[PDB]
Each structure stands twice: as C-alpha cells, then as structure tokens.
Amino acid sequence: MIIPVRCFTCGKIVGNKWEAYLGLLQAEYTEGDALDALGLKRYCCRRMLLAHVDLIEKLLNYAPLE
Amino acid sequence: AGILFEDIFDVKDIDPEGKKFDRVSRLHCESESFKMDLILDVNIQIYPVDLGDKFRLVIASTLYEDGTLDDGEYNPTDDRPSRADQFEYVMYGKVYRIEGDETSTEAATRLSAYVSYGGLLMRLQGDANNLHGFEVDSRVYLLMKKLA
Amino acid sequence: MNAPPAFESFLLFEGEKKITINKDTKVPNACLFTINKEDHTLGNIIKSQLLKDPQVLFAGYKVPHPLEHKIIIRVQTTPDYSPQEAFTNAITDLISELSLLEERFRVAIKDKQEG
Amino acid sequence: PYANQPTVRITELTDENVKFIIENTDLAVANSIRRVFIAEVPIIAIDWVQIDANSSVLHDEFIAHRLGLIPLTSDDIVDKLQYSRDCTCEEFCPECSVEFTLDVRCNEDQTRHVTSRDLISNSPRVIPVTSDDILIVKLRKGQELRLRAYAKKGFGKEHAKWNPTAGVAFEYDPDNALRHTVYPKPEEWPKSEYSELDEDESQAPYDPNGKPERFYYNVESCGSLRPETIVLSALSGLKKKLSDLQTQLSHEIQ
Ligand SMILES: [Zn+2]
Ligand SMILES: [Zn+2]
C-alpha cells in the first residue's frame, strides 16, 4: 500500500528511503547499486525496497469523498 | 584392589568397517601377555588414538582403590584418592553379556565379556581364567592410559 | 480476542510473588525457585553462574510453558552450603560482573571517542 | 566460584552502530546481553494516537500503527522519564509522556507528503530522528490528516516499536574451534569477517579444553538512541533486574 516504516525482520528504518530509491532509479542506477547507495546491506532490508509495490499512488487517483 | 582385569594392549586396527560415527571409532586391539582380543568403541575426538599405539588397560569394580563401593552416582566433589588420576581415558559401563565356548558337558575355556559404556560397546575375548571377575549386570570402570 | 495483553509478560499483578522457594524432598539440599514474569534472560545467566560454583552439585532451569511466564530453577548443593546461599552468591557475582563491564565499556567509549 | 573479569575492546564506533568484543565471559552472559539489547532497553515511542480528522486513503489504525513505528530521539530523556502506568496523573503529564501534534491539510493540487517533519513535539529533546524524513501518508487535494499523539517509555519486550536495535550481529568462535557447529563440508563455507585462518584451512583444529569466549558484537541503532547509549542502558537494566531479583529473594528468605 505504502512503504513500511521499519524493516519487518531487523527493524531498520526503511520508510524514509522510498522516494530516494525511486530518485536513484531515475538516475539510471541498477537496483543493486541503488540499494547499496542507500546503505541496505542485509538482504532482509533490501527485500523490502526491492519488492515494495506502491499502491497509494494509484489510490490517490480517486477523488476524496471529503 | 577391586581390579577385575589389567593388561597392556596394542591397537591393531582403528575403524575396520569404514567410518560410521564421526567422533567414535571401534578400536581392535591385541594383548601381548594375556592374548585377549579387544574390541572397544573410543571417543577419538577428545582422546585421539591412531594405529599401532599402545596402552595399559584396567577394568575395575571401583575407583577408590579401597574396596569402597562407588554408589553408581556422579559425585564431582570427591576427596578420596581416585584410581582415575593414574589414567588418561576413563569410562563407566555395565557388563551385559558373558558368552563362552562351554558345552552342556564341560565348562568354558574361552569367554567373551561384553560391556556398554553408555552405548560405546566393548568386547573382551580370551581364556576364562582372566575373566572370572566379570559377572553380568555389574558396573565396571575402564581405565586406559597410552604407553610410550 | 483471546490475545493476552502485551504487558503481562514482565508485570506482576496483585498478590503475585516475584520469587518462591520450595524444598525438593526427593534429594537433600535441593531447592526449586519459581520466578514469575521472567524468561531465558535471567534463567540462562543464573544457571551459568551457578554452574561456575564448585559446591553446586546441580543447577538447571526451565520455562514450563512459553505462553506462560515462569522459570523454575532447580539448585542442588553440597550438604554444607545451602541452595539459597548459592543463589544469592550467584546473583551478587553477576551484579559485580555487569558493574565491572559497565565501567570498562565506559572507559572503552571514552578511549575510542578521544582516539 | 565468582565472576569472570570481562574485558571490552571497541573495534568500530559510528553514529549508527558500535562494534566491540567481550573476552573472559561465559556464553550465557553474552547472550543475555544481546537479548537485553533487543528487548529490554527502554526508549520513547508513540502510543495513544487520538485522531481528530483523517480523510486520507489509509484508515485510522493504519496511520496510528505507522506513527508508532517512528523512532524518536530519546538519548538522555528516557532515563529520567517514568513509565506511564507508574505515574500519578491522567496518564499524560510531562514526567511520563511527550505530546505530539500533527495537522496537515493538502490544498495544492500536487500530492502532499505527510512526513515525520510534520510531527511537532512539545519537548525539543524528543523529535523524530530523521529531523530524508519518514513518510507517514500521501494526501490528495482536499484531504486532511489532523491528530494528536503522545510518546511513552517502553521497551522492546512489550512491543517492537520500543526495540532500539536495527539488527544486533552476535558471533563467537569464528573458526569453529569448539565444533559447536559441524560442517558436513567445511571447505564450502565462507570465512567470517573475524576469522583468523589462512586460505588453505576451513576450520581451526579442534580444541577439547576450549570454552566460548571473545564474543563479537555489532549493535546497529535504529536512531532513537546512540549505540553506546544502547549498550550502557542495556547493562544498567540487566544489573537493575538482577538487583531487584536479589531484593525479592532476600525478602522471601527472611
Ligand atoms: Zn532488515
Ligand atoms: Zn504522568
């Protein structure tokens, strides 16, 4: 739905890296290089940014009921 | 004394049927004096023995060298002088079988005594005269010391 | 629904004793310490320190059930040294060890920061 | 019959992790210290989220759960703070909690990112550690999120939001000298970073007289506490637990 705050396994903060991850990918980085640049060494943390599907961007297409 | 048996053996084979337990080896040993055949499972990991070694073996009823019964219970705080201090490897088991070449007519000349040190099995074959101390379902201590 | 509250794994409720001693009648000089609202954190460390004592003939611990919060520590000792005395001495040894470790860790932090 | 004399050696100390080695200690003390790093170091984390208005796409419990997981700077305040359950108040006074206020209205057409920057504390010592900032929720034009929340002292045993560590690496016997693990093919296994063997061995020779010692640690902080503060608070808390147990035992014996 949205990027989780913590890494599920180890508890490292990941929610403050989704926009930076996408920005690095727009800079023509391999996904491994992007995750290494963000400093995610344990594959538990890397799994979360590598496999996250951001549906909130799609949910924001619908107008709010206010 | 309480020493049911004593001898010096030499290892003539280490693990004859191929290795089957990564920490235990089935030594086959001969005795030069009593000419007893010995099979004995030894935890080689803590007491490594290789082929052609020699060692004094002693099967004893007790360890306190006074005839005082052991009670068959683990007492780490023992002030009595233990016979085990004169030996490198000490195991504690129960003799569970005494076979022989006896017929219904005559007694046995050759006896084979089997002991189980917690699972580590030993057989001691030889003439009956040296195995009269062994009796089934009695506790024994195997005391083994390498000889130079 | 039936999920227990998260706080009732370290909190004693009303009229619950933190630690209870019961002599073991099967063996002389043996006691069972049932400590409530504890886990392997204290069980394993206290067991290890008790094993370091030379007068302790037996020291073991178990959690009876993981969903419940108790540790039963069985301590058997030589006839001239009570299990309660051994338990107290083990805890004082652990406290001294951790105080020394705090001091040395502080010294190491100061050295690494200065360095 | 008495305590070991443990010796510390700090190998690396950054602002996000501390690496150190403890020698002359039994395995149980080291394991309990790691356990106390994970589950018994108190920090300050958000609890009691009261939502006044939430027209975002994420439902209320989702937002509250995300707020709980935000780490808060609790380096020096948490020790003098009290557990709310023990305090004598309406459960929220400055001596047992820290108020937070979020009030975000998305008026521009562009997607508004509700980050941890938008969490306003009433105490300057306690802020989100990122203040990139942790995204809480994205808002559309006309959507609003407005709430107030507090932050209580708790530790990781109660809930994982209070866990201060982002993964505690722990190791001992890097060459497998004690053979506490038995490799079927030891050649296939990579050397640990603390290994001291050459590139022709796979394991150290077996040591029957060996005992575990020289435990290697690497405590990575999520951010709410400095790693050295995590270790010091951990040792203090374990000592406090043992002293309280001694007090209760002395009362029981008496
Ligand atoms: Zn992770
Ligand atoms: Zn209060």
**C39: Cα separation from own chain's centroid:** 9
User: Cα separation of D68 and D151, whole Å?
Assistant: 9
CA C109 to chain centre: 29
d(CA B39, CA D66): 68
For residues B88 and C27, what is the distance between their CA atoms, to the nearest angstrom? 32
On the 0-12 / 13-18 / 19+ scale of CB atoms within 10 A, A58 is: exposed
Sequence-ordered strand ranges (E) for chain D:
7-13, 17-23, 43-54, 98-105, 112-115, 120-121, 135-139, 144-154, 165-171, 215-221
**Pairwise CA distance, residues D47 & D64, whole Å:** 8
Nearest to B48 by CA among B76, B86, B15, B16: B15
Q: Determine the distance separating the centroid of ligand 1 and the alpha carbon of B110, expressed in angstroms.
A: 70
> A25 and A34 in contact (C-beta within 8 Å)?
yes
Strands D120-121 and D144-154: unpaired
Q: Give strand pairing partners of D20.
A: D10, D217
Least Cα separation, residue C64 to chain D (angstroms): 19
Q: Is D73 helix (H, G, I), strand (E, B) or coil?
A: coil
Cβ neighbours of D50 (radius 10 Å): 9
**Cα B60 off chain centre by:** 9
Among partner residues D132, D138, D139, which is closest to A16 by beta-carbon distance?
A: D132
Cβ–Cβ < 8 Å for B49, B28: no
Give me the helix-helix angle, C83-114 and C40-52, nearest 10°: 110
Tell me D184's DSSP state. S
Structure tokens at B92: 């504690």
Residues 6+ apart with CB under 8 A from C54: B77, D1
Q: Chain A contact for D7, CB < 8 A?
A: no
Tokens of D222: 């999520």
**What are residue D53's DSSP bridge partners?**
D146
Any residues with CB less than 8 A from the CB of D58 and at least 6 apart, and which?
Answer: A1, A2, A56, D66, D137
Q: How many residues does chain B have?
A: 148
Structure tokens at B7: 């001898």
Q: Spell out the residues 6+ positions from residue C5 whose beta carbon is closer than 8 angstroms to its own.
A: none
Q: What does the alpha-carbon distance between residue C71 and residue C94 come to, in Å, rounded to a whole number?
A: 18
For residue D119 the two structure tokens come to 């969490």
D43-160 to CATH, choices 2.40.160.20, 2.170.120.12, 2.102.10.10, 3.40.50.720: 2.170.120.12
Span from the CA of D27 to the centroid of ligand 1 (angstroms): 26
Distance from CA of C57 to the nearest CA of B (A): 7
Could you give the 3-state DSSP secondary structure of residue B141? strand
3-state DSSP assignment of residue A25: helix
Whether D235 and C105 lie within 8 Å, measured CB to CB: yes
Closest CA relative to residue D195, chosen from D171, D222, D160, D226: D171
CA of A35 to the centre of ligand 1 (A): 12
Proportion of chain B in helix, strand, coil states, percent, rounded to 5: 5, 50, 45
Helix (H) or strand (E) holding D247, with range, is helix D227-253
Sign of CA dihedral D232, D236, D239, D245: negative
Helix, coil or strand: residue B110: strand
3-state secondary structure B58-104: EEECCCCCCCCCCCCCCCCCCCCCCHHHHCCEEEEEEEEEEEECCCC
Provide the residue ranges of all domains of chain D, joining segments of one domain with +.
1-42+161-254, 43-160
Neighbours of D200 (CB within 10 A): 5
Q: Find the CB nearest A59 among D57, D167, D222.
A: D57
Resolution in angstroms comes to 2.7
Q: Which long-range contacts (CB under 8 A, 24 or more apart) does A48-52 make?
A: A48/A3, A48/A4, A48/A7, A48/A8, A48/A14, A49/A3, A49/A14, A49/A17, A49/A18, A49/A21, A52/A3, A52/A4, A52/A18
Instruction: Tell me the one-letter amino acid at D229.
Output: T
Give exposure, C86-106, as e/b (b: 16+ Cβ within 10 Å): bbebbbbbbbebbebbbebbe
Alpha helix positions (H), chain C: 40-52, 83-114
Domain D1-42+161-254: which CATH number of 3.30.1360.10, 3.40.50.920, 3.50.30.30, 3.20.20.70: 3.30.1360.10
Method for structure elucidation: cryo-EM
Which residues are CB-contacts of D237 (< 8 A; sequence separation ≥ 6)?
A: D36, D40, D41, D42, D155
Interface with B, mutate which of C52, C57, C80 (most B CBs under 10 A): C57
Q: CA of B95: how far to CAs of B43, B110, B124, D120, in Å?
A: 19, 17, 11, 80
Tell me how far CA of residue B127 lies from CA of B102, B121, B131, B140, in angstroms.
12, 20, 7, 19
Give residue for tokens 């951790």: C98
Question: Measured on CA atoms in the order C81, C84, C90, C93, is the torsion positive or negative?
Answer: negative
* A25, A15 Cβ separation under 8 angstroms: no
Among the partner residues C10, C19, C54, nearest to D248 by beta-carbon distance: C19
Question: Pairing state of beta strands C70-77 and C56-62?
Answer: antiparallel
D217: β partners: D20, D170
- Yes or no: say if D32 and D142 are a contact pair by the CB < 8 Å rule: no
Q: How far apart are CA C60 and CA C73, in angstroms?
A: 6
User: Which domains does chain A possess?
Assistant: 1-66 (1.10.10.60)
- Round to whole Å and give the CA distance between D108 and D93: 37
Interchain contact B22–D (C-beta under 8 A): yes
Min Cα–Cα distance to chain A from D186, Å: 24
Q: Measured between alpha carbons, how far is B95 from B113 in angstroms, rounded to an integer?
A: 7
Instruction: Kindly report the CATH number assigned to the domain that includes residue B127.
Output: 2.40.50.140
- Reported as half-sphere exposure (CB side, CA atoms, 13 A), residue C15 has a value of 0
Nearest to C77 by CA among C31, C12, C25, C23: C31
**Token duo for residue B58:** 């002693």
Which residues, including other chains, have CB under 8 Å from residue A18's CB and lie 6 or more apart? A3, A49, A52, A54, D135
CA D20 vs CA B83, D5, D12, D14: distances in Å: 46, 16, 7, 12
Which residues is D72 bridged to in the sheet? D128
The answer to whether D111 and A60 have CB atoms below 8 angstroms apart is: yes
Tell me how many domains chain B contains: 1
Amino acid B34 reads F
* Strands ordered across the beta sheet of D120-121: D43-54, D144-154, D98-105, D120-121
Distance between CA atoms of residues C74 and C27, nearest Å: 11
Partners of residue D45 on adjacent β-strands: D71, D152
Both tokens of D219, joined, read 């405590």
Distance of CA D239 to the CA centre of its chain: 18
| Residue B63 domain boundaries | 5-148
CB contact at 8 A, C30 and C23: yes
Q: How many residues does chain C have?
A: 115
Backbone angles phi, psi at D244, to 5 degrees: -65, -40
List CB contacts of D102: < 8 A, sequence separation 6 or more: D67, D114, D118, D119, D120, D136, D145, D146, D147, D148, D149
Chain B contacts of D208, Cβ < 8 Å?
45-46
Residue type (1 letter), A50: L
| Cβ–Cβ contact A41 with D under 8 A | no
- The minimum CA-CA distance between D21 and chain C, rounded to whole Å, is 10
Q: Which helix (H) or strand (E) holds B31?
A: strand B24-31
Q: Whole-angstrom Cα distance, residue B40 to residue B21?
A: 14
* DSSP-derived secondary structure letter, D51: E
Burial class from Cβ neighbours inside 10 Å (0-12, 13-18, 19+) for residue B133 reads: middle
